[PDB]
Symmetry: C2
Subunit: 372 residues, 2 copies
């Protein structure tokens, strides 16, 4: 498995309360990050992963949690460190211990720019965004289902971002519960992405990504506005992690929502006698996997799907919307292919979009409690 770990400074706990205190200057005095990480590591290098007293008392929160996850020599551990020298020295100490305890394990330290414990503004405009980007890159750069989010080791402030990333990418998250030696999963609430209400923001999110920041006044031209954006000065806003996650989903959808043209809803209702709700289930199933969806092709991005079955589907994709223009049996399918041999059939379909096909309506059909 690939463990994506937040990292704190609990590796250095033996130094808490001593003077000189453990801080960045301590790291320098002890020779820099790598040299200082050996001094830190030495304080717990004899603690065994099998010793329950040492696991809780002597070992770092990262090591305790990874041991409870059954970390082994076939795993990868990615330690997301603060940019500070003492943060990094602790992460390197954890790496040293994991490599000694489980020879062959792959352990990588990812330093997150702007992630630190003293400057809230740098955290909220850069640190947490860099964290979110780096974690999402790692999820997308490993195999599906392989990642586990482990927020045990530091930054209470990063817990909600781990929850959101986990909800969105389908990645589980676990941590050690308070003073116990027991893991618990973070809660994940099943939700749908609010695509229809967020879509009008798509050009503004793209503008911020291309231009770094735009005037806050463009946002209004209200809870969504506050949660997607960060004030950065001079009346300008950039993205929050939530704004970044929404921008990324709008630019590169990971699910589609099916819509039926006016004609396709008629088509579907006539199929109810022969096929029941099998056509509904199929379209809904196809919309869930736009990568797998990525056929007999027309112009204008129109193309044909076949469920198995008499029914064939003339569709296109516009952003996150899977548009079903027609649902036809084999005879009408053959007639439509003949029209495309004689004419540019796709161009004629879109020419009639407004008069014949629009509005497209979401494929969510409703067909003993007290009244309102």
């Amino acid at each position: 498995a690939v463990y994506l770990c937040t990292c704190g400074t609990s590796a250095a706990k033996k130094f808490f309360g001593q003077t000189p205190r453990f801080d960045a200057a301590w790291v320098t005095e002890h020779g820099g990050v790598e040299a200082a990480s050996k001094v830190i590591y030495d304080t717990f290098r004899t603690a065994r992963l099998d010793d329950e007293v040492a696991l809780k008392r002597d070992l770092s929160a990262e090591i305790h949690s990874l041991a409870r996850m059954g970390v082994n020599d076939k795993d990868t551990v990615v330690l997301f460190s603060s940019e500070t020298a003492d943060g990094q020295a602790c992460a390197w100490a954890v790496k040293r211990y994991l490599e000694q305890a489980r020879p062959g394990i792959l352990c990588r330290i990812e330093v997150v720019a702007g992630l630190q414990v003293t400057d809230a503004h740098v955290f909220r405009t850069a640190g947490v965004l860099n964290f979110t980007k780096a974690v999402l890159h790692e999820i997308d750069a490993n195999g599906t289902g392989q990642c586990v989010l482990n927020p045990t080791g530091g930054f209470k402030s990063l817990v909600p971002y781990t929850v959101l990333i986990g909800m969105l990418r389908g990645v589980p998250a676990k941590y050690i519960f308070e003073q116990s030696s027991a893991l618990i999963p973070l809660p994940m609430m099943p939700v749908e992405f609010a695509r229809s209400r967020l879509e009008p923001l798509r050009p503004l999110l793209e503008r911020i990504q291309n231009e770094t920041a735009i005037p806050r006044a463009e946002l209004d031209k209200r809870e969504i506005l506050d949660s997607l954006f960060e004030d950065v000065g001079q009346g300008q806003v950039s993205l929050s992690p939530v704004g970044f996650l929404i921008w990324e989903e709008l630019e590169r959808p990971t699910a589609l929502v099916p819509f039926l043209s006016r004609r396709a809803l008629d088509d579907l209702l006539k199929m109810r006698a022969t096929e029941g709700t099998a056509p509904d289930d199929y379209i809904t199933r196809v919309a869930r996997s736009p990568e797998q969806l990525a056929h007999e092709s027309w112009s204008k991005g129109l193309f044909w799907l076949k469920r198995g079955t008499r029914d064939r589907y003339l569709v296109s994709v516009e952003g996150w919307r899977l548009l079903v223009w027609r649902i036809v049996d084999h005879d009408e399918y053959d007639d439509l292919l003949t029209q495309n041999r004689k004419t540019d059939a796709g161009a004629r379909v879109v020419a009639e979009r407004r008069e014949k096909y629009a509005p497209f309506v979401r494929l969510e059909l409703y067909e003993s409690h007290p009244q309102f």
Copy 2:
């Protein structure tokens, strides 16, 4: 403002590292929760709310965060405490301090059964549910826009539930960021309830709420294939039995008492709406969506079968009913057809006659989400 604060033991930080350590036995040795809270309070009683060094170094995380929020003598502070004696003694110490610092402040300590730092099983069953229900009850017991969630003081493990509660009830949540002295909001992702995917579970969740738990075998019969699942709604409570988790509780509550409706148009109503495009555009769409988002804004001329009429402001009228979370729009009509329909309802039980034709004339209802290309075509 009503500050809903999760508490920890930072009030007792002056006793950390001592032997005997600060714990439940320490509270007992110092006379119990009330008496021990005075001993804890005495260690910082002389620290001042306007002293910047004291705020960042000497005062508890609850006090520091409340100070940065501008707590004052007209506010209410609810201190959600662990059930442990040391947790409670700290909460009472914070109460003692706030009442001296802001005389007239209303401060109450809410002891959350099952909330504690050593038993993960009791936490994940009783503790988080009791916390969730206590916070939700306080939100619903105060006026709209009055509550602020403050997770600073303790329990890293409760932050995710504060986030979900804040998201679902639209209540702000702020906290002191790490070792800074600055407040930052919890992130709030705008999401849509997966109502179509969750509605099939309404009778299952109601059944679970009517029993102490249900056997896993019965859950598995009610749920789809194991490899295609929803598991976050449920919590194992031992001996092969399952109850609702806080996530399952929040979903169940919303299914039973919706806080927003989703408008659907009958087959006839979408025809009606499209004929109004020329004169009205999408103003009818906006009205229907607006009154659905607010069950308080949602009514006149009741018919039978739960049907009733709405008026936008304009001659159009809407024949509607509510089924669970769905605002069903049966017809949209002009003033003349409205009058003629009222006439049919004086001569007959018109609502009964409408419902008799549900399958043939009105079903299926379609979600009022109408789409009506400047990006690269799908790859």
